[PDB]
Amino acid sequence: KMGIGGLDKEFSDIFRRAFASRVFPPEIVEQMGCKHVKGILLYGPPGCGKTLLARQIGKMLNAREPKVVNGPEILNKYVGESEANIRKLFADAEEEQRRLGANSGLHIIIFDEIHDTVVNQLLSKIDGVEQLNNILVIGMTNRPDLIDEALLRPGRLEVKMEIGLPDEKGRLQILHIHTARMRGHQLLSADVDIKELAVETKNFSGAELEGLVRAAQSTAMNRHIDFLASLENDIKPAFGTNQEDYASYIMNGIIKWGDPVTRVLDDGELLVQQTKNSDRTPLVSVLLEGPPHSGKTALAAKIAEESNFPFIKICSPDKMIGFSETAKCQAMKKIFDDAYKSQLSCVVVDDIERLLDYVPIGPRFSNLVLQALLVLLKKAPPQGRKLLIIGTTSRKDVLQEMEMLNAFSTTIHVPNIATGEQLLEALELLGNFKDKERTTIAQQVKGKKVWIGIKKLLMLIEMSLQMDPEYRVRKFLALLREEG
Amino acid sequence: KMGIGGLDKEFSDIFRRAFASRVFPPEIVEQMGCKHVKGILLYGPPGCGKTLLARQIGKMLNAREPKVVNGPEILNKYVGESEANIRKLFADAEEEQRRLGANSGLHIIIFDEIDAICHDTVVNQLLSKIDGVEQLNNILVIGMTNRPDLIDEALLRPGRLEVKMEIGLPDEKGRLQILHIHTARMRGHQLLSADVDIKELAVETKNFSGAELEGLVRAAQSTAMNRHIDFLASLENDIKPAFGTNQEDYASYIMNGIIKWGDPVTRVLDDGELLVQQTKNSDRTPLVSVLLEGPPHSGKTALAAKIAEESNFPFIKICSPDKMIGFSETAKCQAMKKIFDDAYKSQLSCVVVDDIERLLDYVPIGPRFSNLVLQALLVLLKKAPPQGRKLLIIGTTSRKDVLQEMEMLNAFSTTIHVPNIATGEQLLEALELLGNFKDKERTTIAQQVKGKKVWIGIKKLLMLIEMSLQMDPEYRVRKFLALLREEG
Ligand SMILES: Nc1ncnc2c1ncn2[C@@H]1O[C@H](COP(=O)(O)OP(=O)(O)OP(=O)(O)O)[C@@H](O)[C@H]1O
Ligand SMILES: Nc1ncnc2c1ncn2[C@@H]1O[C@H](COP(=O)(O)OP(=O)(O)OP(=O)(O)O)[C@@H](O)[C@H]1O
Ligand SMILES: Nc1ncnc2c1ncn2[C@@H]1O[C@H](COP(=O)(O)OP(=O)(O)OP(=O)(O)O)[C@@H](O)[C@H]1O
Ligand SMILES: Nc1ncnc2c1ncn2[C@@H]1O[C@H](COP(=O)(O)OP(=O)(O)OP(=O)(O)O)[C@@H](O)[C@H]1O
User: Which residues bind Mg(2+) (chain A)?
Assistant: First the structure.
């Protein structure tokens, strides 16, 4: 019953279905009158440690098959030849079967990361023309869709198993085996707690866990010449579902220069709570319109932080620079798929107008990306999962023409400072100019109208700070004069 | 007379053309003075268990053929070889026959995955032996190929493979035959499941291939094995397919269901059902087209889907934007084409196109749309299924105007409007059916809305309800009202 962390119910059923029908001795099979299943295939997100499962299963099924491994290329060596080889590893099994056929020989052959002749070659050998039973094959692949349809049908590959990311209880199981092994030997860390580690991590693949423990071991080794596990949590992943990177996007934090910002956050909070509640629709779409510049992206990022979903991934142009419309679309699809994988998914789209490549002249924009996006907002996550979409548009007006705007469920304005009060409020929270300086600025704005973002303001501020301590204030007022 | 589930009449024809000529003894052939046909080819959709049929024919035609099996690859070995090997395999039966030609030896060679077989010269080589200048009669070849089109024309042609067999998905009676044999074998031994009925399983399944059908049964004994350490079969029905047809799925598309908030929705559903009946009964016209036009958030896709459960057709599939992202006009065309082909393959079926305006790639500015997909759509829309075949197609749109200017609208036989709620009380009715709010607040809303005018789509409305819930109990309704007014 060891060792494989998590995957016990699914594993149990799959195990039963392939193995139990074979196992009952011996009249039972005739009574069943069912040909033994030919193969079981598992398709999983990358990094799920499918392979460990396969080695264990192969070992478990027979005293000795004894295991056969197939290189991914399979058909490597062009001249005749290789294709024949793909026929050949099977050939040994078929030969054994003709020689002893009836009972009781089982051969296991496995192809990792599974065109022309080889397709047909495998299909013919696995099923038909005559017999070919008494052997089983398991295929491990990152994506189901890539693979050919014909293999899939019940028969040659009747059962297809999808391996989910570990359950928290399951996550606790993967960590639990390694930890238990550490437990059995005297050395252990008292501070570290299994329940605590489990509660802390939702997203991680098995691998991720073994990786974390291993890193903790390295850290421990290092100390001799929470604890190490806590330090590993602090660094080691690189999870790809962790979103440590997202926090960095905002260089200057969020400044409460005024009430509207707070309103944006309680609103963001409401959106998060709603998506958390889970009735009806699990998908919500938001686009927030603000004057060019300010923390459009920053606000979105803070909302994402607030949400605390297991999976947060930010789709932005910068990652995608120079890509063909098709390449960008592929990347986007990839990220959304990854988001589908998590039970809870949070996604943000960065400068949506930029993605489309809208150009005011023309107007020319890349249609393929827009349609893909519209389908995606329209698209609904597979059951049991809730997805959060955040979109930031510099200007809505383009979008209203687009009809993009209709698709989005809710829209939040994020206006630039329009009053002297909010202005000084910003200078104060930012704490840049002196009390005297700020008093002067106030005496030069209070009662007057303004129209400037926060980031743009930050810029003007540093630009004014460069000038001598006697020219800073005047310079500032000289800048605010141009940015009206 | 065993064993092959379904495929009996066709089986009789396949049997009859090759076997009848050869079997009659012996003057009959000379009186006919007709040369025996060389080979039979059957081409089928995947999973029809064609291979089982081949095995049966191989067992059945001769006491010993002796059966010959050909690897798909055929052409393996660069060094000599493949051409030579192919000729060698062809040659032996012929040599036996030349040695004894007259009577009484017939030789059967079986071919699997012909498309791989038929590259360059090696394909040419096969052709020569069958159509060979001297004799070569009394040799029988059967080829199983998933796709007919790929194979060279000369093989299809009378002579080497005069007869071409097309194998249809199992008939319900036939489906009953495939299930019936395994079940019967189970019947013969004492163990059986009393609850399970063959007719019931058959009525439940229309679409499935015979191999797949065996597979559910395979699932079922296994479930029984689990049990020892309807019934199990019912569970298998729940998770055996993987049908590749219908895939129940609709609940996933129809997430919240179809409540009866209004008079119009019922009329529309009924209309759809009447049209379904009409499809089922009209012989003059093979193809039926319908289009649903509504303001955005109407629920048009869900309604179309609802109609699809209602038809109860053997094969139901939905053509979706969601499925296709990032493709190029030609890729969209291929996918659409294949799906519609799949519909032709079934005897009668309903195919639903969802968000057509989106499907085209259309955007309001320009306007910009991708032409190739659209043309594909129109030709497909005009088009008539192979005779004796009926297809039901549903189109979902909100941009009717654009379609009308386009001339898209004209192709459709009929259009049914699917209007957003216009009376506030009707909207209230939707609320009690959904049953979300408590009695008093609903009364307050009723006081607020009665007598006033509204334009709310149903999905959009539910979303508004969800938005309303999030606020505190004494902050739920006012929030809702504010959303409605803002939406105004
Ligand atoms: N839940 C788990 N059960 C078993 N092994 C796991 C699990 N999570 C991670 N692993 C690790 O993963 C390995 C086997 O699965 P693996 O992650 O290799 O699948 P994979 O998709 O091939 O991985 P990768 O894509 O990172 O190469 C084992 O060595 C084990 O350390
Ligand atoms: N009150 C605040 N609101 C928003 N951002 C703030 C605030 N205080 C400091 N910042 C910092 O300002 C940055 C905002 O940049 P952002 O691009 O989001 O603004 P923008 O006007 O949308 O610019 P762009 O037009 O390039 O999108 C963030 O990195 C954030 O950390
Ligand atoms: N209607 C049916 N009649 C006979 N056999 C069936 C039927 N449905 C399923 N089968 C099973 O399927 C097998 C024959 O169909 P098979 O899957 O070989 O056709 P195929 O399309 O050539 O398969 P593939 O293309 O996947 O290799 C038999 O072993 C039989 O048990
Ligand atoms: N009478 C009705 N007609 C349609 N949908 C209804 C009805 N009553 C309740 N609903 C619910 O509303 C939802 C409508 O979903 P659907 O995706 O069809 O909307 P839609 O027209 O596609 O919206 P959009 O076209 O803007 O994406 C379904 O979950 C359905 O259960």
Answer: 297
